[PDB]
Amino acid sequence: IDIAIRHVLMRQGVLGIKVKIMKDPAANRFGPRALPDAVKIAEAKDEDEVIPAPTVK
Amino acid sequence: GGKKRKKKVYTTPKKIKHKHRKHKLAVLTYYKVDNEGLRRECPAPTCGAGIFMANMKDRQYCGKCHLTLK
RNA sequence: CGGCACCUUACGAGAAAUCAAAGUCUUUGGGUUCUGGGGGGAGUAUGGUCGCAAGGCUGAAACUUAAAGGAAUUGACGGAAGGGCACCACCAGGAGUGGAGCCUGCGGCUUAAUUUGACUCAACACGGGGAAACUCACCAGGUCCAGACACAAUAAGGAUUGACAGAUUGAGAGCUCUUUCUUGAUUUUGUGGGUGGUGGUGCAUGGCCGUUCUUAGUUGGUGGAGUGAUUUGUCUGCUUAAUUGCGAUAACGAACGAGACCUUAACCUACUAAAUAGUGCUGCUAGCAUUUGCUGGUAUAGUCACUUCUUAGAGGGACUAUCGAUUUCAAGUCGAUGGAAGUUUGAGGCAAUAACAGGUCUGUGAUGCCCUUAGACGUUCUGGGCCGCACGCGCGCUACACUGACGGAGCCAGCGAGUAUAAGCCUUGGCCGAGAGGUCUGGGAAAUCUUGUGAAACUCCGUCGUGCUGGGGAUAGAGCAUUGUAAUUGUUGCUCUUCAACGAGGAAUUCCUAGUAAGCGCAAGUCAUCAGCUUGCGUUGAUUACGUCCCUGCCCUUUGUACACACCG
């Protein structure tokens, strides 16, 4: 999260502005690349067919 | 807050600043002339020629040099 | 067949609550009686009538008033109910505070001024607010423009600048005055207009911070319910520190908060290393006994080795792991064992939605509007004040002693900080001085020097001997030093002398569950000087719970409400 706060000068008085922009963790080139509690599990490599017991010398 | 800020009362009288005194055509009475033919001058190395003293109580004093003699 | 009812539905009705009639009513007509027409005045007055009476029946008007009222919704509140929770709650206790003296802040009073903000928690050692000057905003006085710029005027035959000597002034301010000298179109004067302000308004604001409330809470999409406000999701039960989980399920999928996370503490003879850490050896060497021993100094060139202790990257480790039990046997929970660690392992940083007329305009060259702007509310200098004292209050420090005071001796931490042509940093060692301090050197911009910060409580050996006593050290006299331009209204330190109150503190009331409380110091912040204050840090190290909802509050559900400025209604 990066934050910018500015003062706005108006004829009646100052207005305050706050902008908060959250970036994508996956697009973070500096520190962490994911949120701390975000868990990624790999896709399975299963439902495969197996040939009883040959050997390739 | 401030209790109806005091309206100044002045024990002393109104005081007046100082303008510059006038002296018409000073160089006229600076120099002496006779037909068909002057106070003093500062001798300090600050200015040199072209500065006039005054005639106080037997005392001299210029203005471009704050020095007194005799 | 008749009757007293009930349950479900809601086609239908209704503002809804609800209704088998309160349905068959704008698609408005089966018969018929009675009653109402905003709220009050008022079922009052008057007349009549009935009554033994009490009263009953009939029954106005003047005048007054913008709502009153019904049903439901969300919240809030309840001396309502049911669940759960907290040492800013209690219980069992510890230390106390409240009582004294003093330090400090607040009110009051005084004042020339004693600047000012804040008043339950959530004002009162708070404004980092320990003010001699400055700070500084207040008070008595004296300067200066640092009033941009554009006009207009004056004016070079002078717009204007300063300053010797006196007088003058607190002042060696040419501020002002006598004085003729100096300088020269940057300036002076009037207009327009700027600028500054710790001036006002925090009830005009931004930002920040505090609080509600540091609990478990908060929100939309689509779908379901409701004419609507709204509601379900977001929940009976069990469980958790937890809206956190198991699950239940008119929802389903999600978002925030919680948790995860980050910092820090504890373990690692497991990696990488160390001449700014430490060590084993080895030279050279000390004293003491000679067994080849015991304790040391030394060598950052000893052209040695190493990493247990120290440092810090890069990792490992805890996940409730094992075993008994119990419980939807799901989530969990309780005992042991092992383990450095088994309360989420200990401590923190971070922290949702809605809000408050909470605080701050005196942090800000953050600001709108108002005010003021040359005898200034700008700025600066001198001096005073913020400390002023019949009195009330808050945070504290010293104590009232023998579990002690004094004198000797022993002798152990941890977090930290530090400068140069100064306006001057941390200071070892040597010398002088009773001390406080002075002086000369040298090290250190720092794991290198200060510094093993040799801290204080504490431990040992004596003196004192139950008394306001050698407990306590306020108040005061005299003297010596240091900081500062300046110590008077004692800045602070030191020496002698003076030697108060206080004998454990009424009603009340605070904080706290383990390396915690209490006690004890140290460093850093403020800082020329000054710490009885804060923020951290270690040293010594407990008593008592490990529970509850009685008090004070908090969360959720049900329920009542004539409350919504929300019971301080």
UniProtKB/Swiss-Prot annotation, chain A:
Origin species: Candida albicans (strain SC5314 / ATCC MYA-2876) (Yeast)
Included stretch of the parent chain: 169 to 225 of 251
Subcellular location: Cytoplasm
Recorded superkingdom: Eukaryota
Name listed for the protein in its UniProt record: Small ribosomal subunit protein uS3
Family: Belongs to the universal ribosomal protein uS3 family.
Function summary: Component of the ribosome, a large ribonucleoprotein complex responsible for the synthesis of proteins in the cell. The small ribosomal subunit (SSU) binds messenger RNAs (mRNAs) and translates the encoded message by selecting cognate aminoacyl-transfer RNA (tRNA) molecules. The large subunit (LSU) contains the ribosomal catalytic site termed the peptidyl transferase center (PTC), which catalyzes the formation of peptide bonds, thereby polymerizing the amino acids delivered by tRNAs into a polypeptide chain.
Subunit and interaction comment: Component of the small ribosomal subunit. Mature ribosomes consist of a small (40S) and a large (60S) subunit. The 40S subunit contains about 32 different proteins and 1 molecule of RNA (18S). The 60S subunit contains 45 different proteins and 3 molecules of RNA (25S, 5.8S and 5S).
S-S pairs: none
UniProtKB/Swiss-Prot annotation, chain B:
Residues bound to Zn(2+): 42, 47, 62, 65
Disulfide bonds: none
Crosslink position(s): Glycyl lysine isopeptide (Gly-Lys) (interchain with K-? in acceptor proteins): 1
Function summary: Component of the ribosome, a large ribonucleoprotein complex responsible for the synthesis of proteins in the cell. The small ribosomal subunit (SSU) binds messenger RNAs (mRNAs) and translates the encoded message by selecting cognate aminoacyl-transfer RNA (tRNA) molecules. The large subunit (LSU) contains the ribosomal catalytic site termed the peptidyl transferase center (PTC), which catalyzes the formation of peptide bonds, thereby polymerizing the amino acids delivered by tRNAs into a polypeptide chain.
Quaternary structure annotation from Swiss-Prot or TrEMBL: Component of the small ribosomal subunit. Mature ribosomes consist of a small (40S) and a large (60S) subunit. The 40S subunit contains about 32 different proteins and 1 molecule of RNA (18S). The 60S subunit contains 45 different proteins and 3 molecules of RNA (25S, 5.8S and 5S).
This protein's name: Small ribosomal subunit protein eS31
Segment of the intact protein contained: 76 to 149 of 151
